[PDB]
């Protein structure tokens, strides 16, 4: 986003949610901007939108105002495989760097046309399930439509020693 | 749900892995080793787009 | 599949997760081995 004295409004929120039944609008409407890494050097971005202008989780110095842009949502720093991690902020970072590579190791329907293609080797889960824990990034990875595992009743506990 | 972006070559689906490279036609200033005669170097990777 | 199409090979620290990697590369998605931080994901 770009900000003055927030460029984008709840009006533009409807200029889109209706059209679902445009983005290049927001680009040419001057409400958004493609900032490469060097152009970042000469800008200042606001983390959360409403949270960065004028019990729970502790915050920092949002009061220092001079901002030029805003972060769409903080989540978007992730690659696909790491996006499906639920609550990566409550996880030792290496755990995240693993599940990222293990989500690629898992099973489940990978394409809906598996019955009709002759690919050397391929696993498919018997009854895939959309996870109970979902990130809002999931709707775009088409992950609820092509899950990778199952929601198992998991009892964290000692029992037999196996 | 297949989104493409890949080629099909004699059957197998081949993907092109993003090859990273330190850009050209840019000027960069570098120190050098302690025993190196050169104190500093200015580099440009001259290449036509 | 998706992860493979948004993959970044970097030839032979150039591995360390950089600040300029914010927003453009995944801070976690990278393989443990002779590629950790070298071959990144978008």
């Amino acid at each position: 986003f770009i900000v003055e004295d927030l460029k984008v409004r709840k009006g533009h929120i409807a200029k889109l949610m209706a059209t679902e039944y445009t983005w290049s609008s927001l680009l040419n409407e001057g409400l958004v901007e493609y900032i490469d890494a060097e152009e970042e050097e000469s800008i200042l971005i606001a983390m959360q939108p409403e949270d960065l202008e004028p019990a729970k989780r502790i915050r920092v110095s949002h009061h220092a105002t001079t901002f030029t842009h805003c972060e769409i949502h903080p989540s978007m720093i992730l690659g696909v495989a790491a996006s499906i991690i639920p609550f990566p902020d409550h996880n030792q970072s290496p755990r995240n760097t693993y599940q990222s590579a293990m989500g690629k190791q898992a099973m489940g329907v990978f394409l809906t046309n598996y019955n009709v293609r002759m690919d050397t080797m391929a696993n498919i889960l018997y009854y895939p399930q959309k996870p109970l824990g979902t990130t809002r990034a999931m709707e775009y990875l088409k992950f609820r439509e092509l899950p990778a595992g199952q929601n198992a009743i998991v009892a964290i506990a000692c029992y037999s020693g196996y | 749900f297949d989104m493409g972006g890949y080629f099909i070559i004699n059957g197998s689906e081949k993907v092109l892995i993003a090859q990273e490279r330190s850009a050209g036609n840019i000027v960069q200033v570098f120190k050098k080793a302690a025993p190196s005669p050169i104190s500093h170097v200015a580099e440009i990777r001259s290449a036509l787009e | 599949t998706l992860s493979h199409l948004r993959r970044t090979n970097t030839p032979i620290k150039p591995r360390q997760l950089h600040n300029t990697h914010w927003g453009l590369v995944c801070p976690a998605e990278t393989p443990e081995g002779q590629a950790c931080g070298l071959v990144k994901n978008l």
Binding site: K10, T22, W23, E50, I72, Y140 | G4, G5, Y6 | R6
Partner: peptide, 30 residues
């Protein structure tokens, strides 16, 4: 009402928009 700024939930409609145009293989294709 075209007035108010935006909320944390409103941003998601923006992200939803980004893909419906570019998608996930955006750069690979372009």
């Amino acid at each position: 009402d075209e007035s108010a700024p935006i909320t944390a939930e409103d941003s998601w409609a923006v992200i939803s928009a980004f893909f419906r145009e570019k998608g996930l293989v955006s750069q690979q294709l372009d």
